[PDB]
Amino acid sequence: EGLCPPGHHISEDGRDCISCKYGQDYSTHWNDLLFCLRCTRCDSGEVELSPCTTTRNTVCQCEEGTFREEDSPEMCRKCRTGCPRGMVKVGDCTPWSDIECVHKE
Amino acid sequence: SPSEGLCPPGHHISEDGRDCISCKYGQDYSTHWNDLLFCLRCTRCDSGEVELSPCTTTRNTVCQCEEGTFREEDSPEMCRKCRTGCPRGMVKVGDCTPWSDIECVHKE
Amino acid sequence: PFATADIAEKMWAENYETTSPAPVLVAEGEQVTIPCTVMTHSWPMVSIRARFCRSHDGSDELILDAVKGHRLMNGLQYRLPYATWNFSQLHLGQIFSLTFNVSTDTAGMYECVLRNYSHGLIMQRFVILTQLETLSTPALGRYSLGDQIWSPTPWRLRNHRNYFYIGRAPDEEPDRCWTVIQRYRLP
Amino acid sequence: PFATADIAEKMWAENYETTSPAPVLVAEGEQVTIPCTVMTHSWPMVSIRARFCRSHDGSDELILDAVKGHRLMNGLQYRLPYATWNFSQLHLGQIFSLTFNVSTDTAGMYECVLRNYSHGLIMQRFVILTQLETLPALGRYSLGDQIWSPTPWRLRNHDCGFQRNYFYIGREPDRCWTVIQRYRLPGD
Ligand SMILES: *[C@@H]1O[C@H](CO)[C@@H](O[C@@H]2O[C@H](CO)[C@@H](O)[C@H](O)[C@H]2NC(C)=O)[C@H](O)[C@H]1NC(C)=O
Ligand SMILES: *[C@@H]1O[C@H](CO)[C@@H](O[C@@H]2O[C@H](CO)[C@@H](O)[C@H](O)[C@H]2NC(C)=O)[C@H](O)[C@H]1NC(C)=O
Ligand SMILES: *[C@@H]1O[C@H](CO)[C@@H](O)[C@H](O)[C@H]1NC(C)=O
Ligand SMILES: [Ca+2]
Ligand SMILES: [Ca+2]
Ligand SMILES: [Ca+2]
Ligand SMILES: [Ca+2]
Ligand code: NA
């Protein structure tokens, strides 16, 4: 379902599939969009692991020592360097997780 | 027995759907034909309010804000002392009633 | 002379003021729907509570069964005789709603309420206006978060002591909606 | 490997936090609906945006036309192949929604979004969960920071599948964690 394949958007007359612009925009699925979706531009604190193509978004990862927050505003956060006294460290610092600190109290 | 599955104003329906039971005067009421398991509790006028009319099984208590106060329609819907008159320079355009505060407009 | 009704013990949700949008100016004759969404909760009933701007005391309620959505009492019948309503079970919550044509006598404060026989938890308020009056043309937009009066069709704003309304595609009776309108602003 | 998507330039509504309810624990195989209500506005599109707790990067959107409600792109079809959706014009606003059956792979963060080709204004978030891991008096919804369930009387307590338990309702990294932790279980 959708007139145009990935990498394309539909023309104004509904007849044609026009290609997205490489490095500008994209669309991942069959679709009836009048325009392609803008590519994500990696931020400071982020490494571009893979560029935008007309068929997939840029892959931006949080720099080593920082992790991806999924709450608003979904930016990179500095990992904790460890747990306070009386707490044990469980998780460790990845680009998708801070370290976890659990109390014994 | 219910009319069209419904019990009359001043009544609520029984759990099994067979009977219409009268609301208790002074305590609760229903204004319309209904399938309620219970009648609605009557409003008790808070201080700051004057009871114009009592609850009956068929209509709610009518509570009016005391003279010099007005009914606020925003949360929490309580009576509020009307504010003082309009400042010199400003014109009075609303007057303090049980349903309105005083209203002031500037010459600006 | 007329029978009135109300919620005996009113209560307001914590986020009542943040979820309730600015009042909306709508043209007479337009069919609108008051949309209510609640997370699965433990009250026996829900309602759509109306307080009309004109000639009205207390509040009128469409009381529905919270589980199955059946009408228990339509307290709205006199004032909105041709109104219809809907109830959808989403498991995680229910949507219930009220559909009517807007007129001068149906302008009002409309609320989504969780209800028992004595108490109601007012979750959210919508204020539907047909006319706005002023003393001495603001850039009325469509909805944007804030305290800004707005309209779905603002390109049809007209200007009849000024009088604002939305043209299709005065008075002196008290306006019960005033104390709520005044807490918002024109653009 | 897998192609991914997202919103290029995200924004959040002022009241995003106060209108988004605490996460909800639902039984696997229950049919749920994400309901989205929006006041008439001036964006060309709307979407239901999904970030799944598991095996998922970026976000997937069901993009609908904001005026008429027709599907523009169902970015959700692979992870939710049976999902259905609805759209209603209420004049003053629109209700759009997504209906699917809950499972471990459909647990996730589900947002209502005003959308154009580069920007999305994220209005409201729903967090649907099937499992809670611990190292409680669960209720139905009642305003706040408190995790809940539509059917709390069916809450169960397993071990795996420390000092650790597995909470679920019933008959690998978890990307929802940084949101989940911002809320709490009931004490009593
Ligand atoms: C109707 O709703 C109200 C509000 O939930 C209930 O009153 C509360 O009752 C609980 C337990 O009985 C108490 O903890 C509170 O003191 C009451 N709350 C308030 C705000 O007054 C009432 O019990 C409900 N009525 C029925 C018959 O279930
Ligand atoms: C997509 O939406 C965004 C955000 O609403 C638009 O960017 C805004 O454009 C307005 C009007 O041109 C400006 O006043 C703002 O500076 C922009 N806001 C932000 C937050 O960037 C963008 O123009 C829209 N795209 C299209 C094609 O209309
Ligand atoms: C209300 O007006 C609508 C158009 O907005 C029209 O379809 C209908 O005839 C009216 N319905 C009732 C019940 O008055
Ligand atoms: Ca009585
Ligand atoms: Ca009452
Ligand atoms: Ca469930
Ligand atoms: Ca999401
Ligand atoms: Na569908």
Author numbering:
A (entry chain C): 78 to 182
B (entry chain D): 75 to 182
C (entry chain A): 32 to 167, 175 to 198, 208 to 216, 227 to 244
D (entry chain B): 32 to 166, 176 to 201, 206 to 215, 230 to 246
Q: What does the study report here?
A:
Here, we report the structural and biochemical characterization of the novel, non-canonical interaction between UL141 and TRAIL-R2, an interaction that has evolved to inhibit cell death mediated by TRAIL signaling and mute host defenses. Remarkably, UL141 displays no structural homology to TNF superfamily ligands, and instead utilizes its Ig-domain to bind with high affinity to the TRAIL death receptor. UL141 utilizes at least two distinct binding sites to selectively engage TRAIL death receptors and the NK cell activating ligand CD155.
The complex of HCMV UL141 (residues 30–279) bound to human TRAIL-R2 (residues 58–184, both numberings start from the initial methionine) was crystallized and the structure determined by single anomalous dispersion (SAD), using experimental phases derived from selenomethionine labeled protein expressed in Sf9 insect cells. The crystal structure was refined to a resolution of 2.1 Å with an R factor of 22.3% and an Rfree of 27.4%. One UL141 dimer binds two TRAIL-R2 monomers through non-crystallographic two-fold symmetry resulting in a heterotetrameric complex. Structural analysis revealed that UL141 interacts in a head-to-tail fashion to form a well-packed dimer that is stabilized primarily through polar interactions, such as hydrogen bonds and salt bridges, and several hydrophobic contacts, while burying a total surface area of 1423 Å2. In contrast to TRAIL binding to TRAIL-R2, which leads to head-to-head (180°) trimerization of the receptor, UL141 binds both TRAIL-R2 monomers diagonally across the entire UL141 ectodomain, resulting in an approximate rotation of both TRAIL-R2 monomers of 90° to each other. The high affinity interaction between UL141 and TRAIL-R2 correlates well with the large solvent-accessible surface area of the heterotetrameric complex in which 2694 Å2 are buried on the UL141 dimer (1347 Å2 per monomer) and 1351 Å2 are buried on each TRAIL-R2 monomer. CRD-1–3 span a length of 70 Å, and CRD-2 and CRD-3 form the major ligand-binding region in the UL141–TRAIL-R2 complex. The combined structural and mutational data suggest that contact patch 4 is specific and crucial for TRAIL ligand binding and that viral UL141 mimics this structural motif to specifically engage this TRAIL DR. In summary, patch 5 involves strong hydrophobic features important for the stability of complexes throughout the TNF/TNFR superfamily, and we postulate that UL141 has evolved to mimic this interaction in order to modulate this TRAIL DR.
